């Protein structure tokens, strides 16, 4: 599992469940091309997006549909979505966890990159 996403809800103090997200890879076109997607689990996590062989160096975008999440809860949100854009880099074995902490008018994202 070279790439995992974890989403937390700062209003309810809970995993953010059933959050849709899409992963894109930058093409030589300089355009965003679909790569993988899913919905977070009851633990707010999404595993199995890609494989070591598929997840080569390049620029990736993770788009988290925060707006639909807050709309489901009946809370007016600010952002259309949360986006995390980064270069995947081979430097020994690397696993990427993208963590996101959601509030209606604020979000934070952190990368935990381990070996």
Torsions phi, psi for 18 (to 5 deg) = 60, 35
Using CB under 8 A as the binding rule, whether residue 20 contacts a second copy is answered as no
Question: b/e per residue, 60-73, with b = 16+ CB within 10 A?
Answer: bbbbbbbeebbeee
Query: How many residues lie near a second copy (CB under 8 A)?
Result: 33
For the chain, the straight-line distance linking the first and the last C-alpha, in angstroms and rounded, comes to: 12
Contact partners, residue 39, CB within 8 Å, separation at least 6: 18, 19, 20, 21, 46
| Residue 89 C-beta: closest distance to a second copy, Å | 9
Could you say which residues in the range 50-89 bind a second copy, by CB under 8 A? 59, 75, 78-81, 83-87
Using CB under 8 A as the binding rule, whether residue 13 contacts a second copy is answered as yes
Does 45 belong to an annotated binding site? yes
The residue among 85, 83, 28, 25 whose CA lies nearest residue 50 is 25
Structure tokens at 93: 């074995």
| Residue 15 C-beta: closest distance to a second copy, Å | 7
Using CB under 8 A as the binding rule, whether residue 18 contacts a second copy is answered as no
Please report, in range form, the residues annotated as the binding site: 6, 45, 108
Q: Enumerate binding residues for a second copy (CB under 8 A).
A: 8-15, 59, 75, 78-81, 83-87, 99, 101, 103-114
Please report, in range form, the residues annotated as the binding site for L-thyroxine: 6, 45, 108
């Amino acid at each position: 599992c070279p790439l995992m996403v974890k989403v937390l809800d700062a209003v309810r103090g809970s995993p953010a469940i059933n959050v849709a997200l899409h992963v894109f890879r930058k093409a030589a076109d300089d355009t965003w091309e679909p790569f993988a997607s899913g919905k977070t689990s009851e633990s707010g996590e999404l595993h199995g997006l890609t494989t070591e062989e598929e997840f080569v160096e390049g620029i990736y975008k993770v788009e988290i549909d925060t707006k639909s999440y807050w709309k489901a809860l009946g809370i007016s949100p600010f952002h259309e979505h949360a986006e995390v854009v980064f270069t995947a880099n081979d430097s020994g074995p690397r696993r990427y966890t993208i963590a996101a902490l959601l509030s209606p008018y604020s979000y934070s994202t952190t990368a935990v990159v381990t070996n």
